[PDB]
Write a structure and sequence with these properties.
This protein is mainly α. The protein has a single domain, classed as Bromodomain-like (Histone Acetyltransferase, Chain A, Up-down Bundle). Helix content is 57%, strand content 0%. It starts with 13 loop residues before the first helix and ends with a helix.
């Protein structure tokens, strides 16, 4: 509350560390469904159904330009990518499996780097 704060966690390395995680997600062999925005002209139903599209290149641009206020808003966009994927793709599909795999890969790096 006013003049009452928990001890100050060092957040000075968070930007650099989120960048490293994102590099690792970018270079994963199963990243290909997520590297670029879904083409809303060429994929019927995507625009109407997925209210907040997100992809790794859009996260990269947001990260590089100071549009994440803190590490939690970064994680929320990464998770959005996988939530979108599950909304539109059957579990038993190459893309559906890719999304589950990448979400696992992310959540471990996230825990190991920050928890």
């Amino acid at each position: 509350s006013m003049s009452v704060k928990k001890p100050k966690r060092d957040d000075s390395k968070d930007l650099a560390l989120c960048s490293m995680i994102l590099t690792e997600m970018e270079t994963h062999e199963d990243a290909w469904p997520f590297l670029l925005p879904v083409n809303l002209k060429l994929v019927p139903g995507y625009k109407k159904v997925i209210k907040k599209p997100m992809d790794f290149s859009t996260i990269r641009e947001k990260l590089s330009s100071g549009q994440y206020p803190n590490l939690e808003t970064f994680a929320l966009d990464v998770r959005l990518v996988f939530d979108n994927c599950e909304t539109f793709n059957e579990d038993d599909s190459d893309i559906g499996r890719a999304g589950h795999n990448m979400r696992k890969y992310f959540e471990k790096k996230w825990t190991d780097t920050f928890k």
